[PDB]
């Protein structure tokens, strides 16, 4: 399936937050 992007799809959530 596609349940293999959003795993880090989500990082760049908090991760955009951390630099």
């Known amino acids: 399936k ?3 992007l959003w795993n880090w799809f989500n990082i760049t959530n908090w991760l955009w ?3």
């Open 17 to 19: 937050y951390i630099k």
């Open 2 to 4: 596609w349940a293999s």
